Each structure stands twice: as C-alpha cells, then as structure tokens.
Ligand binder design. Structure first.
Ligand SMILES: NC(=O)c1ccc[n+]([C@@H]2O[C@H](COP(=O)([O-])OP(=O)(O)OC[C@H]3O[C@@H](n4cnc5c(N)ncnc54)[C@H](O)[C@@H]3O)[C@@H](O)[C@H]2O)c1
Ligand SMILES: [Zn+2]
Length: 323
C-alpha cells in the first residue's frame, strides 16, 4: 500500500508493505551521496539487509536525541564535503527518525530525507514532518517541521520487536483508532483483545495503515499544529510527564495519559467514560501497571483542546492512583 500527502505542493509517498526496503534503491540513484544514519541496535539486527552511501551509527533510541550528538553528526557529515543534493536516510525508530530528520532539516539549510521506520510506533513518527531533539529542559523542545522526500515503511522490520516495543507502539495505533472514532476503537479492541494476539502482530498491518491514514488527514489538514493537529496530542499531556520521571517507554506513558485524559473529561464534562473498561483493556494487553492545555475526548467524535486547573488534575491523579 502506497499512501501520499495531498498538500498544494511538495508532497511525499508513504510505502507501507512487507519488503518496502527495496524502494530505497530506486531513490538512492538521484543523490550525490547518501548517509545511512542507523540506530546502534538496529544496525546489529539488520546490518545485512543494507550491506556514495555511508553508514553513520548513532546511539540507541533516545540516547541520540541530544544537542551534543546533533553537533557531532552534522560535523562528521559536513567533513565529507557534501552537497545540497545529499540524502539522509533514517533507518530505525522514532528517535533516530527525529534526530536524523533534524540533521537533514538543518544540514546546508535542508538536504534530501528518506524515512525508513522500523517500529510500530514509527507509523506515527515518520509521518507529519516533526523532527528534532531533546533539551536539558524537556522532551523534543528543539526541532523543526520538515517533509521527508519519502517514507518507506517495511513491515518485516517489525518481526524483531520485543513485546516491550510492541506495547509501546500499540499506544499510538490505539490513539489513532480513538481519534478515528468509536467504531474504529471497538473494532481494534475486539481484535487485539489480549497480550497473545497483540504479541503475534496478526493484522497489525491493517491497523497500522488505518493509523497512518488517520494522521495523514490531520497533518495535511493542519501541518503546523495550529488547529486539529493538536488532537494528535491525545494523552501526551500527562504522558510526556510520566515518561520523563519514570523513564518508561513512550507508548506505555501515552496509555497512562490516555487513561488520565478520560478521568479528566469525566470531571469537567461528565462524559461517563468507563475508566474501569480502559484499565482492564491495558491489563489484558499486558501493560505493566506500576490553566494547562490538554486534548480531551468529551465523546467519540467530540475531541476538544482546553486548559485544566491543578485541582482537577490533582483529583484526576487521585482517581488514577485508585487503580
Ligand atoms: N511526530 C513525531 O515526530 C513523533 C511522534 C511520536 C513519537 N515520537 C518520538 O519517537 C520516539 C519513540 O518511538 P520509538 O519507540 O520508535 O523509539 P526508539 O527509536 O527508541 O525505538 C525503541 C527501541 O527499539 C529499537 N528498535 C528499533 N527498531 C527495531 C526493530 N525493528 N527490532 C528491534 N528493536 C528495534 C531501538 O534501538 C530502541 O532501543 C520518541 O523519541 C518520541 O519523542 C515522535
Ligand atoms: Zn506520540
């Protein structure tokens, strides 16, 4: 399946399929040089699937998204007397994509950029143009909006994901379903009903694709997060925090924030959200359970963005600790 952005100009394809890795060669030709920036671990796993093109091994996961690693990689690459017709190919998860993407965005004011996502959670991150690094202050505080030349998503990369990464990635697949509606949420809940099915990845393809289409509507609609793209931050308000203190996986935190979010909506609008229902769903999936802006779902199809006071968040956290 090939998806494609529909902006008034400068659009990119999104190849989602088992074996899409092939499509990378078709591009590589039209580039002077190509820098294969690949994750430390990811390189171990697929160094062979890849062996004018240079491989740059960067730290694992979030370890590379530092301002320091940003200077070193740009410098190292710059030393290779590059040109504006150079491409940065990002092989790895969301962390490498963001980092490599920020290098590609700032190198010579912007060079060519190929996204090669290898995680479930990367179905979300490789789409939309958000790239960047973290700051000693907080998460993705420094970055840019920069459209890749193409997104090449090969589903076979997913076969080697520990369950920990499956769970983490699922949170985003599930967030999109939530944002996509009540019918898509009950649809995905019934399929991925337990840890076993989830861990097997059976049918994740369809849901991943569905997830990309959902976001592809929102980001083409509101590219710079000036309107509806803020709905994508569902459960990231409380998620982004929890993550930075307990350093759990990104997706694990989102789920906790998605629960939290439901609790808050119940306080304000009294949505009558079966919190007990969502909690049990996380338990069945195998999730280890151990005015501030905010994207709140008042009802499926009625997503809102508004401030919330400490007292409401204080009470929303009280309720959550119940579980
Ligand atoms: N719009 C956006 O740009 C956006 C949206 C969502 C999340 N994010 C960012 O993305 C990151 C989270 O995504 P992530 O989970 O992919 O991060 P990640 O890069 O850290 O990948 C998770 C782990 O999986 C390993 N891994 C990668 N591919 C693998 C594979 N096929 N087999 C086995 N192990 C593999 C990595 O080495 C890493 O240890 C965060 O840094 C977050 O801030 C950005
Ligand atoms: Zn996210």
């Amino acid at each position: 399946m090939k998806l494609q952005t529909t902006y008034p100009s400068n659009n990119y394809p999104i190849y989602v399929e088992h074996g899409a890795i092939k499509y990378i060669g078709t591009y590589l030709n039209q580039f002077d040089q190509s820098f294969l920036l690949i994750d430390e671990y990811v390189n171990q796993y697929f160094a062979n699937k890849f062996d004018n093109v240079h491989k740059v091994i960067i730290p694992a996961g979030e370890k590379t998204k530092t301002f320091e690693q940003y200077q070193e990689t740009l410098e190292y690459i710059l030393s290779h007397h590059v040109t504006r017709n150079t491409a940065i190919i990002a092989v790895g998860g969301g962390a490498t994509g963001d980092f490599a993407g920020f290098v590609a965005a700032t190198l010579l004011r912007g060079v060519h950029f190929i996204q090669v996502p290898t995680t479930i959670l990367a179905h979300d991150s490789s789409v939309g143009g958000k790239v960047g690094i973290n700051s000693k202050q907080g998460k993705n505080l420094i970055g840019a909006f920069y459209r890749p030349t193409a997104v090449i998503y090969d589903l076979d990369f997913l076969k080697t994901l520990p369950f920990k990464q499956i769970l983490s990635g699922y949170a985003e697949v599930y967030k999109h379903a939530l944002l996509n509606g009540e019918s898509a949420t009950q649809d995905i809940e019934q399929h991925f009903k337990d840890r076993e099915i989830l861990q097997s990845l059976n049918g994740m393809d369809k849901y991943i694709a569905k997830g990309i289409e959902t976001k592809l509507d929102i980001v083409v609609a509101d590219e710079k997060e000036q309107g509806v793209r803020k709905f994508l931050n569902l459960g990231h308000t409380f998620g982004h925090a929890v993550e930075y203190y307990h350093k759990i996986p990104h997706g694990h935190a989102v789920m906790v924030g998605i629960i939290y979010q439901f609790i808050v909506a119940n306080a304000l609008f009294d949505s009558k959200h079966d919190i007990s229902h969502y909690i049990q769903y996380l338990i069945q999936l195998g999730y280890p359970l151990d005015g501030v802006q905010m994207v709140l779902m008042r009802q499926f199809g009625d997503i809102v963005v508004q401030h919330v006071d400490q007292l409401t968040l204080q009470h929303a956290c009280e309720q959550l600790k119940t579980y």
